[PDB]
Design a protein around this ligand. Sequence first.
Ligand SMILES: CCCCCCCC/C=C/CCCCCCCC(=O)O[C@@H](COC(=O)CCCCCCCCCCCCCCC)COP(=O)([O-])OCC[N+](C)(C)C
Ligand SMILES: Nc1ncnc2c1ncn2[C@@H]1O[C@H](COP(=O)(O)OP(=O)(O)OP(=O)(O)O)[C@@H](O)[C@H]1O
Ligand SMILES: [Mg+2]
Ligand SMILES: [Mg+2]
Lengths: 665, 574
Amino acid sequence: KIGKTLWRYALLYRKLLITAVLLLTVAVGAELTGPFIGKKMIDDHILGIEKTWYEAAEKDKNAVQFHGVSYVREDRLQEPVSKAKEAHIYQVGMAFYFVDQAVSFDGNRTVSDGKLTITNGDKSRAYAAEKLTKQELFQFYQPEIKGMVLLICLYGGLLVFSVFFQYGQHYLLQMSANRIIQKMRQDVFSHIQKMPIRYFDNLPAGKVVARITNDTEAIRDLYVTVLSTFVTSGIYMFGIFTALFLLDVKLAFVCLAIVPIIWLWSVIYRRYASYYNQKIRSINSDINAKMNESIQGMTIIQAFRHQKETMREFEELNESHFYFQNRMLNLNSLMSHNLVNVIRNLAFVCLIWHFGGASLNAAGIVSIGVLYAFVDYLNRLFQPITGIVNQFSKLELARVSAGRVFELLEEKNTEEAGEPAKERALGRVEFRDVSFAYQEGEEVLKHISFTAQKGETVALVGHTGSGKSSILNLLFRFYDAQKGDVLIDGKSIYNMSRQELRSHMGIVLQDPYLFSGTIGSNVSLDDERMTEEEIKNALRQVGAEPLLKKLPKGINEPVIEKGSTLSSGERQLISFARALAFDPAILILDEATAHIDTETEAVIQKALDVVKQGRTTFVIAHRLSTIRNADQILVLDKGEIVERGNHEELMALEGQYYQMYELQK
Amino acid sequence: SVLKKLGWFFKAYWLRYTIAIVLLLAVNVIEMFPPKLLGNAIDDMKAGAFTAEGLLFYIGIFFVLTAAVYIMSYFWMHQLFGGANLMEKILRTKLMGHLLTMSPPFYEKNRTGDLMARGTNDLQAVSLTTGFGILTLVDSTMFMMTIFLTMGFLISWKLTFAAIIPLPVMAIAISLYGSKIHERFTEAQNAFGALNDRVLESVSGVRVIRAYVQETNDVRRFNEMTADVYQKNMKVAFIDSLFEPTVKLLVGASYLIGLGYGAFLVFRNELTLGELVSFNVYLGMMIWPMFAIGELINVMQRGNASLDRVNETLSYETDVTDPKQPADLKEPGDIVFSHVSFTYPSSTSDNLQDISFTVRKGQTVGIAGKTGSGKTTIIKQLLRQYPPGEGSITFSGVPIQQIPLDRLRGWIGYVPQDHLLFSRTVKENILYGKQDATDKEVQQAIAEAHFEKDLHMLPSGLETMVGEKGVALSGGQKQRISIARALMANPEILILDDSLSAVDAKTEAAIIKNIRENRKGKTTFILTHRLSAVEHADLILVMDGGVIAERGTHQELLANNGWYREQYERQQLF
Ligand SMILES: CCCCCCCC/C=C/CCCCCCCC(=O)O[C@@H](COC(=O)CCCCCCCCCCCCCCC)COP(=O)([O-])OCC[N+](C)(C)C
Ligand SMILES: Nc1ncnc2c1ncn2[C@@H]1O[C@H](COP(=O)(O)OP(=O)(O)OP(=O)(O)O)[C@@H](O)[C@H]1O
Ligand SMILES: [Mg+2]
Ligand SMILES: [Mg+2]
């Protein structure tokens, strides 16, 4: 399952993520204690003036000195005093009136002509007032300046705590995400390494590269952005809701009832996004494969003037990719951060509804600080939901990509790989009624049977489709024979390990392949068991290339794929040296000299091959001269060995070999 | 910087974006209301002036505003996302139209995986920045400015000011962070191309990597590459972890300044507790998005680097093999080389030296020589794959340069030495030289290249799906198809270039007979290592190094006692 596999990959790094979430919690603690400080400041400093007054300030925080006497209101007057029930200030419009008289009741603040006007409909002993305004005497809030400055400095201090912990959590999250991606990519490459050749044979090369690189990059984006934002948003929401429940429970309940809303939006987005994104990723893999094929074969795309028809084919994937992308506009325009604002304007409506309903009963004004804190927390709560929804889009895309990737790491047709080789083995090789058929009934080989005897050279010369390369494919276990046996030193190669079997044999494959590096790095394939065997094993058949070269062989660099800057015949001498460089017990030559002039080939290669004749060889040859002295020549016709024997016994027979030999001279 | 490189796109679809900007401005303006409405409602609540009628007014206003903003915001979201999709499409079309018309000299500097990246990945990044990046940038800028003006005019100009002075330093921090992030995204994007062509190299050469047991060294190299990439990304993560906390700290400093100074101001009798809430909602809506505007740079600069890569690919002047030449010849006629001294771009020594051979209107030319001797270096002069050298190649009397590349490639029928087939059917591959043949004409080409018999062996018979790079057929079945590919038409010049290297000494004789009968009067360029394939040639050139040593007909080169005679005796005795 995609979710279970992603979770297990996360569990591979369970300390970094736990530490990151703990650090982020420590940061969010201060980030959200801020507004609680604001509420405390508002409810005790700016609405403290409403308290009672009229003590002589015997001690504590001195007093306000309104007219000629000391005034302290509540907080620093809490020491045992005679507070009485007088000297209450009130606010009406922009005018602050000090009644300075025993106040009976309250509820409706109105002084008009210095009276008490109405008090919840009671009208209890209208009282004389006294206007103050702004500059008359505003030492009334003097005791609160110290508290405000202390709260400001407290939050300023908490900001640095937050900065340190935010750095820590961000760094840990990024490191964990990158480590997870590293592990996933390594696993993908290992699995591709243990894949049958059939998989690589009927699949475009660009499709495998697309799968691995592109889908792992999409999963990387997932882990490094989507999941990091998910964790941060979840912790922030967790903290904000915990704070909200500490202010009002019913309003907090209705505001928290939006989590089911987010779940439902996630489901509705996920359906359509999954379908359209699976289509989009399939089309993108097709695009990558087409790009690879076009670039690889560009030489004869232009020669045969296939550019317009090649542009037509590519534009049909580009147009289809665009079309399936434009089906995202409806979803991504109706379910983007847009809707979050609609929730923002609808969550504030509940705030106003609740607080107004409480106010009509003279209960919603009990704590304006609570309202301030609840507005700040709503703003904070709606800050991260935008990131949540953006990551919701990215998450659907990456879910599709991960589903694509894990369809590769599950494949149960893989092949066990016992890497270790063993000591040198005698070149004895045998076939026993080996019938092999590509794709079921189509048989390419029928009852093949032959044997080498530890030093003999087996020619195996036939016609252009007989199946001479299929024998090599069976011998190298690229393909498993469907009938018969193949044995090396009397043990079935199917009781071996493919690496163990292939360690015995060195092959000059048809269609030579060079790697991007140096020439000496191709003769060696970057193997430490080399020393200076490069020049010695290239001195054979390569004694004119490393001389004209501006660099001395191991420094001059081929380029991508087969060395584009090498002649087709020079790329086959490097493959021949590579095969000889890896000293094999059995040497397979699959038309190793098809692109090499007959002088170089015949003289040099044969002269320096006969000397090392204490070694079994297989020489798939269309040049019958290079196999004239083969100790046993086999004639393959329609996937069947029809004639056997050395050159003399095959010419005396006057058969297919005789015909070909007489024709080639 | 990023926008200017992107200015071509915006002045091409200006209604789709000017209307989006107008709608964005309208939604911002009508979103400036709810905060002030809430402030007024709270102020009314405190003074006991809140009535059910006021409640109805407020809920109705909020419903109308939210509905309007949603309706008229869905439209500009739909414009910007569609514009991003269109940008991706046009960029992909431009890229894949530039990759064609590009000659080998370009392709020997740029790797296939690098180009696949500079397509898929870079275009995805550019599309992401164009839609999401511009969206967020413009929306945030308009929101910030409108909030600033609203707070200044409706609340206070001294409390709005001094609540933004943390932003100047924020601008410098963003500048530094974005400037360093550009330099760490050109390498991050480049390292993706290095991974694409690393996997592509281990997939194409899977047989060689497995034939010699090397699956563990390949995995080790891949692991080392991944470790290097991880270290680079962790340097980037360190920079981002330094950047994010300062963003958050400046946001918190601005919030604290606003809140504390407003609380102080209420005592100076310059603000009402209702106005506080309004101001501290305005500033909150301004600053809280900066928790993500810091991350916006990670999309902007990724898009900038990706577009830089795409623009390096696109601003690659077509190699000196540019047609840029009208001429009225219509018939290749004679082909004369006169002092050709071509030198390959990645070479330091002359690859050809004073080549001075002539080919008449109907003549088979054999080319023999040693390996790496220049046999196919002469052929690639008529293929216009590389810049011309320091001589003349006068098709008839007209230099090869003054001949459009379309007409010349129509003249030439080419059989590459290295097989190049596509993942199509056999008939589809054969129908590459004509593209509009009847099944009768495709059969004639098959018959000429001794492939009629092998069709019976194939399971499908012209519907066999040769497979990727043609690996579903023997090596000599791939070659004969290629011969058919060149024999489907009737090219004035047929270039073979070792077209019988995989054929069983009897298919070779039949194909040579068929080509001799087919090209009796037409011009052919046969390059071979078996000198029995150019016995009929009117002129044989023997190469060595870059210059040609021997020349003449077959009977003339056996009287020279040179390389040709020695080769012939080595090959005619066995
Ligand atoms: C999930 C991961 C992330 C989690 C993130 C963490 C979540 C965010 C955490 C935030 C922590 C906030 C800390 C508060 C500090 C500043 C305020 C202060 O001290 O003064 C307050 C003290 O108030 C009182 O004494 C009255 C009772 C109410 C207490 C409210 C704060 C403590 C909440 C319970 C703490 C325990 C619960 C802890 C959580 C379970 C308010 O003062 P006031 O209103 O002026 O009081 C007088 C008002 N009057 C005059 C009208 C009468
Ligand atoms: N693209 C290239 N860039 C640089 N040098 C090249 C390039 N292609 C070939 N060369 C070199 O130029 C010389 C001539 O090569 P060319 O391919 O013409 O020889 P050739 O006779 O066709 O080879 P062969 O007989 O092997 O088929 C050789 O040294 C070869 O390695
Ligand atoms: Mg073969
Ligand atoms: Mg050649």
